[PDB]
Symmetry: C2
Subunit: 556 residues, 2 copies
């Protein structure tokens, strides 16, 4: 009935047998128990000529309180594809350790569309996030040590942008002063902690093509500035070698499985606002060699995660999407029309009509702006009536797109058969003219404007004076030709979370612009950003427990 019940009651295959389904020898894998394995990244060099699998991006409409979660569809579509005899696998992100102790934690997907072992994935898993945190904190220690030991690079300690990290929900570490207790114990400065997944190490980890590229990106990281305002890099500190060493094992993608034994890579986990919201390039590229179909996803709605998957990841990974699945629900669209959280169980075509343009804007963006075959996945809910479901299908058909019902949550891979059938159809029959919505040689401001106008539907962008200054400085430093990562709210196409549906007559306000040199993109900031979540009054930690066997209870 519950997710954990279904997970712990399911009969699961040994990971070797899962690895066999994607043509991996037992010399290619390293066991972490019977149900987890790391796959060596060096084998990707052997498949240099094999040609990529069909790539299916699961995205969604702007998230709402009604549902939803697109991962059940990602898992389900992978399960359904294998039930139709296709050699398919999936690539997901790994979840952060911190929130599990705040707000319980949950399944990668849910119902009969999950990945397992759930307990391991929601704790240490294979240790990647620890390795990522250790790299981040080595760099922090080496920055301060260099200053402490003489400061030949002339780093202004007040201008260190690099932050420490920990994978806990600890608001107490948001703003600190460290290096206190006299000259024997450091150099006093203002500092702060991000949760590990927010570190630039994570974005670099997830965007590296190979171990060589990983080290190059690490060296490229800008940790701060000199007294005269010159960037100082991790390479100047000779830190990249040691950081790569700490990430040697972690960089190997993790093989797990769905409930129905579909191979699954769970690897990496950056944010979808201040970063790109996708799982590792190494895992995606490796999955594209070892299978015939690959279903992956990007965080939040298609205005953020998909936009960044297509305009950042695809171009850095040199991969091309063959299909997009835009997940949605009737309830969510009624919410976009004006219906209150409590009143969503009642039929309302007029609200559905008013809030449906949110989906249509997304469907329009993928088909018309990006030029990719698209299908809409409607997750079934008891409340839904035929009239409601028909209007969605009707409006999607006006854009030349099918809206298929999905019951992957209740019925697993069977519930995704019709979706899977349609996905295969649009791959074979649908026209694909994919290209990123902007060219790399465009100016940073123009790129931010392009995404704002083309994807969000804005009249334009209002840059603050500080933003304009920062852009000029970044272009002066030689970063004009990198992609753009806009940090804004997920709940609306605009930068105002209240404006639901398909807002018009609006502009985006960019307050600041900051480079992530390792990641290789510029972050454009709109509102306030949370990089370190806190715990609630009654943390879920209080009800987590162990004893005989262990047997960890209270996680879910």
């Amino acid at each position: 009935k519950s997710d954990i019940e279904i997970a712990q009651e399911a009969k699961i295959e040994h990971i070797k047998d899962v690895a066999t389904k994607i043509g991996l020898c037992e010399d290619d894998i390293e066991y972490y128990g019977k149900y987890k394995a790391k796959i060596d990244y060096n084998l990707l060099k052997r498949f240099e000529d094999k040609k990529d699998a069909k790539l299916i991006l699961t995205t969604a409409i702007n998230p709402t309180p009604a549902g939803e979660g697109k991962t059940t569809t990602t898992v389900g579509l992978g399960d359904a594809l294998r039930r139709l005899g296709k050699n398919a696998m999936i690539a997901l992100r790994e979840p952060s350790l911190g929130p599990v102790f705040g707000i319980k934690g949950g399944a990668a997907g849910g119902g009969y569309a999950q990945v397992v072992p759930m307990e391991d994935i929601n704790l240490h898993f294979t240790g990647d996030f620890h390795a990522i945190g250790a790299a981040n904190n080595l760099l922090a220690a080496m920055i301060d040590n260099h200053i402490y030991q003489g400061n030949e690079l002339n780093i202004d300690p007040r201008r260190i942008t690099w932050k420490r990290c920990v994978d806990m929900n600890d608001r107490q570490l948001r703003f600190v002063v460290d290096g206190l207790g006299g000259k024997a114990n450091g150099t006093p400065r203002e500092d702060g902690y991000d949760i590990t997944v927010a570190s630039e190490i994570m974005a670099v980890f997830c965007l590296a093509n190979d171990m060589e590229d990983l080290k190059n990106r690490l060296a490229r990281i800008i940790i701060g500035y000199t007294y005269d305002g010159k960037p100082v890099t991790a390479g100047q500190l000779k830190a990249q070698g040691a950081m790569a060493a700490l990430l040697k094992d972690a960089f190997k993608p993790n093989l797990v499985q769905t409930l129905e034994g579909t191979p699954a890579f769970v690897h990496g986990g950056p944010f979808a606002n201040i970063a790109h919201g996708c799982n590792s390039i190494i895992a995606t590229k490796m999955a594209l060699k070892l299978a015939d179909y690959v279903v992956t996803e990007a965080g939040f709605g298609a205005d953020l995660g998909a936009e960044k998957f297509l305009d950042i990841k695809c171009r850095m990974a040199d991969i091309r999407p063959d299909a997009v699945v835009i997940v949605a629900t009737i309830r969510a669209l009624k919410y976009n029309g004006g219906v209150k959280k409590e009143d969503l169980n009642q039929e309302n075509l007029d609200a559905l009509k008013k809030g449906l343009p949110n989906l249509l804007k997304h469907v329009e963006n993928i088909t018309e702006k990006y030029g990719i075959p698209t299908v809409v996945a409607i997750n079934q809910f008891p409340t839904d009536t035929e009239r409601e479901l028909a209007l969605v299908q009707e409006e999607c058909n006006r854009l030349g797109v099918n809206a298929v019902l999905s019951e992957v949550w209740a019925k697993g891979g069977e519930g995704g058969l019709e979706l899977a059938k349609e996905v295969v159809r649009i791959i074979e029959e649908g026209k694909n003219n994919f290209k990123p919505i902007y060219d790399l040689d465009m100016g940073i401001a123009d790129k931010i404007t392009t995404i704002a106008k083309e994807i969000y539907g804005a009249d334009g962008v209002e840059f603050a004076p500080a933003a304009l200054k920062e852009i000029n400085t970044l272009e002066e430093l030689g970063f004009k030709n990198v992609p753009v990562c806009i940090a804004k709210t997920q709940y609306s196409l605009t930068d105002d979370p209240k404006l639901l549906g398909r807002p018009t007559g609006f502009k985006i306000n960019v307050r600041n612009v900051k480079i992530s040199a390792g990641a290789g993109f510029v972050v454009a900031l709109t509102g306030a950003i949370m990089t370190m979540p806190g715990l609630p009054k009654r943390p879920a930690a209080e009800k987590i427990d162990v004893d005989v066997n262990g047997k960890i209870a209270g996680l879910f």
Copy 2:
């Protein structure tokens, strides 16, 4: 040939095949690749009424700038016992991650007496220290959250004794102020970081009998005090279940091997000054059920590690040592006699006899105070003369103990055959009257006095006023009947590191006394303690590197 070259060239068995030597099937072990495995701690409870293996404690004379073992002897002796057809295994500590990036990694042992894989052990290994850190930092976050959300327990944030941690040599975190940035972001307070291995979680982890005992020790931890001076525990914050959950897999002992395939547990790693300097109780007790002989060790010289192994660990684990090996070198003895670091290669029987009393005191302690069969191990060195060796043997025999030559560094197991014979002999023939040198009934000050008097050969102890008040306070809080852990210099029997040989007519100055309630012992402080070491001018990290293939270089 360097240590890393020996380890890299050695032909090593599959851990399955190592495990079978101590009666373990694949269903008992949990792989971490081909060469590492975790063994379930619950396995111990079905060997309930099996008789314990022969327990051998490897210890040493006081450390010197020269060298002396100690681990090489522990590893080589295990190898030697197996060569004699005995079912022997070893238990060692895991090294901290931080120091590796400052002053390079080191072999678990040395020469031809190593434990492998060396690289993995000097990095993340099986992830235990990350888990231990996560538990520590979860508790920190829960303390601050509780205060932040209302502080029903009435914790005075200025009297929080619990510290955050990280496994990096970062002096910048020794003294901090956190909780800044206004009321949305915490409560301002003074704070600090320990290196992870100094966390009390490490001591609790290492002293827990089982999961039930682990959870009870965790809940028992005092994290600070209320505004009216009452202790506040992790139990009251309801964090023990969550911390236990983080430590579930970590608490399972790690199985690895020596170069000659001798089974080896590597588990836990606390300091030998502010803690007891032994590997985990769970690994030792579990080794005692799976083998016929178990060789283990404690940090620093017998005045520290052995004292704490015998007076703290043994009583808590309910184990009895059968033999003790005191490792020593001629050069180290001559250094105790006043010879300089540079002039040790020349023969000097005058200095040898002058510094021999250090060894004689340790031999006297183990044989007369503790009443355990003892053998002295002399690690061979080319410059040692026959007359020097003869003097040491004569003096040892004067106290009814043999000094056996050990060549385990150069010759491996073969070099320790003669030691193993003598170890087997003193077990069967030697009179064993083992008892700790103090009963738990005794008061805290008397317990401290007894150790100084008996083990260090002190005239007594000068307790500072603060120490006297702290001892009384603790006894009133109900901590009178707990063991005592004296933090002092390792280089001398006294608290003055300059005083070599066998000093007489001295007293130990105890400035403070602090409780580790989870660990279940009291810490007596003499001098200054470093719980967070710094990086040097040119960190080893600078020469650590990875190539295109992911091969790590420069770690050693």
